[PDB]
Design a binder for these strands. Structure first.
Ligand code: ZN
Length: 609
DNA sequence: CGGGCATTTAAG
DNA sequence: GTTTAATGCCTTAAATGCCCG
RNA sequence: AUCCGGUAACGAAACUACCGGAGACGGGUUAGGAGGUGACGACCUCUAAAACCUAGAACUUAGAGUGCAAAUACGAGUGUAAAAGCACUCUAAGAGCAUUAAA
């Protein structure tokens, strides 16, 4: 959609007297969701043993908003049913609420207490987006990773059947593709006869029981197999990181937290004086009513209502007076053909240290209702992507690569590791975290194993949260975001200054054929006049200045520019089997020695030309 | 002897 | 510890629990 | 102790060796540049900073500007006398993020 973000620091945006509440809210929200997520996961596994294989006479357990909302209430110590009024349809809520409450009494090894989980902020609206995000994560995990569970089970089933792991991939690969497009799948859902892969999107809750069983089978059925091959998956996501997470603040959410009667009454005077209209507000109860009730008549258009929302932010924040206002005041970017004008969307995502502003197109501002000839002159380049070496660009005579170490130095990986360990060791958490919680695997789907991790953490939860709340940890998150741009931008600049001029030598490379030299003599003065051949597999930022095209990667690691076939193979017959040394298999070759970076790039460039 | 304020839930 | 794939981007009326000059 | 370029054994690999260059998150405190005598050096002075402490700022690349840091000649043997780096403003090109899972 037409929604974009501007990420900056939060200093100066919120007033000092209001910044205290925001920081407390971030900690309070994290604690509720982090503990609530564990409670929800524990309850599901209790019901998991109710039925497998799935019975045909009952429906599966499907989570909804009220499920998580009740979990949050239990964590905060609210033991009374949340049902408003009484009704036969609402009776189901009461039964579920008591069922989860009893689980809380057993998940933790001591009687619940109400005053140990005190909170004093109206986080009802803020937690709403977090609950939706958590439930969305459940759907995404189930609907987009089932095939990966199949691979793990099958590649362990082969080992259990006596096959050495050399043959496991031989059969597993075909089985996975064939079955997706043996007993790990449910009954066909779609009556239209579409392939089995389609059924995964029909309903995630049907496939969820299978994934849990796969985890239990990996832990019990395949216990004899090597633990390295049985690295556990996580069917049920939950918030684990102790670092406070970002929260979403809207016009309604901001109003609830930072508004009081003595402050709300001033809003009426300021609005009346500047606009000559008195708002229909008496107390905090009528603050967030509809526009028609507030002004007494229907708005002419959505934009009129939106302007009222912006004034709400203006009175409570320095939106129109802070440093960041420069980038939100109707900014138009120079090279947009449509000339889209952007303005603030009355929404903020922040974590106390960093703030992200939401900016939308001016054509939709308001309250939202629920619902090839250049190849002749262009200079060509070729590169083969990878992971040990991220990129390797060549012009046929010279090579440049974007090594992993380059980004590590740019992002200060070593310094960040040292600082984090030093701070943790000061509080004494190193001994407990490295020894106690290391053994207890949180990803385990066994009710016993998960309970032990949950209860062990509860004894050190308070210490852990305070230690990780230090701003140093949150500052590093901004640093990696900022420095990642610098590393890629510098490399892009280096590419231009390397191939911007003709090569000074045309004989160093023996394998350089006649075709290669033709593309090296052209001069190019602009980023957009360079075309880089790329593999099928950072590229998304490269395309912002450089033009790119796709070349097949098949057999590019063995083919040779000037040979009848794939003469290249990894070196063998030496004391040390090194990483990627390449050696030719026959004398009829231009170069008897090669490496993956040069070999792969040259073949791609040859195909490009 | 009365009236008033602030959370929170619900469907949309 | 880091990268890729996936989803998302929200408003307003009524119940009730509490409070004190 | 990592990164960049070259040398060898018909483009060597996280070590097979050698030669030339870059860099250490922010705030406190350290050694290096430069100056009364723009001799030399002694003390002082402007700037600045690795190991240690610390609830702690900041959209990114190319270039262009302004603006910094000041208190051996003569009279008869003998007395007087711009560097490292930083800040601001410009021109050109870019500019959506939160969470989970997976490898
Ligand atoms: Zn060959």
């Amino acid at each position: 959609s037409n929604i974009r973000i501007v990420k900056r620091k939060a200093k100066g945006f919120f007033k000092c007297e209001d910044l205290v509440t925001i920081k407390d809210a971030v900690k309070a929200a994290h604690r509720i969701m982090s503990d609530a997520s564990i409670l929800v996961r524990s309850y599901y596994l209790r019901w998991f043993q109710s039925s497998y294989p799935l019975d045909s006479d009952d429906k599966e357990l499907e989570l909804e908003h009220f499920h998580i909302s009740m979990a949050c209430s239990i964590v905060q110590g609210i033991t009374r049913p949340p049902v408003r009024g009484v009704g036969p349809e609402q009776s189901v809520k009461i039964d579920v609420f008591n069922d989860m409450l009893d689980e809380y009494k057993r998940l933790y090894e001591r009687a619940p207490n109400d005053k140990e989980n005190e909170t004093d902020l109206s986080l009802s609206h803020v937690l709403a987006y977090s609950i939706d995000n958590l439930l969305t994560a459940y759907k995404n995990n189930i609907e987009a990773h089932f095939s990966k569970y199949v691979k793990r089970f099958i590649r362990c089933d082969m080992l259990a059947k006596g096959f050495n792991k050399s043959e496991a991939n031989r059969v597993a690969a075909i089985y996975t593709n064939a079955y997706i497009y043996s007993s790990l799948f449910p009954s066909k859902i779609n009556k239209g006869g579409f392939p089995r892969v389609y059924d995964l999107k029909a309903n995630p809750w049907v496939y969820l029981p299978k994934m849990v069983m796969i985890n239990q089978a990996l832990e019990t059925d395949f216990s004899s197999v090597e633990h390295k091959e049985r690295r556990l998956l996580n069917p049920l996501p939950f918030y684990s990181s102790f670092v406070p997470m970002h929260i979403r603040i809207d016009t309604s959410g901001l109003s609830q937290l930072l508004m009081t009667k003595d402050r709300l009454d001033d809003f009426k005077r300021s609005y009346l004086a500047e606009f000559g209209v008195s708002l229909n507000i008496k107390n905090k109860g009528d603050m967030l009513a509809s526009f028609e009730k507030i002004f007494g008549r229907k708005a002419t258009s959505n934009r009129e209502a939106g302007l009222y929302a912006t004034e709400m932010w203006s009175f409570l924040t320095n939106l129109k007076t802070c440093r960041q206002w420069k980038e939100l005041d109707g900014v138009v970017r120079k090279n947009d053909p449509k000339g889209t004008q952007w303005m603030f969307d009355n929404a903020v995502v922040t974590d106390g240290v960093s703030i992200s502003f939401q900016v939308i197109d001016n054509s939709m501002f308001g309250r939202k209702a629920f619902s090839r000839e250049e190849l002749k002159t262009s200079k060509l380049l070729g590169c083969d992507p990878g992971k040990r070496d991220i990129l390797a660009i060549t012009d046929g005579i010279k090579t440049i690569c974007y090594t992993k170490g380059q980004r590590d130095m740019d992002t200060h990986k070593t310094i960040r590791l040292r600082t984090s360990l030093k701070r943790r060791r000061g509080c004494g958490l190193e001994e407990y975290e490295t020894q106690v919680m290391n053994r207890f695997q949180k990803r385990s789907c066994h009710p016993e194993m998960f309970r032990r991790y949950a209860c062990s953490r509860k004894r050190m939860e308070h210490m852990l949260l305070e230690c990780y709340s230090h701003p140093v940890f949150r500052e590093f998150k901004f640093l990696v975001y900022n420095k990642t741009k610098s590393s890629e931008h510098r490399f892009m600049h280096r590419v231009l200054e390397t191939f911007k001029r003709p090569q000074t030598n045309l004989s160093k490379a023996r394998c350089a054929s006649g075709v290669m030299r033709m593309n090296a003599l052209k001069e190019v003065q602009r980023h957009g006049d360079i075309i880089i051949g790329w593999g099928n597999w950072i590229r998304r930022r490269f395309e912002s200045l450089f033009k790119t095209t796709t070349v097949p990667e098949h057999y590019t690691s063995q083919e040779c520019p000037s040979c009848k076939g794939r003469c290249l193979r990894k070196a063998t017959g030496n004391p040390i089997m090194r990483h990627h040394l390449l050696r030719c298999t026959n004398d009829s070759c231009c170069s008897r020695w090669w490496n993956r970076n040069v070999a792969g790039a040259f073949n791609i460039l040859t195909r490009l030309l």
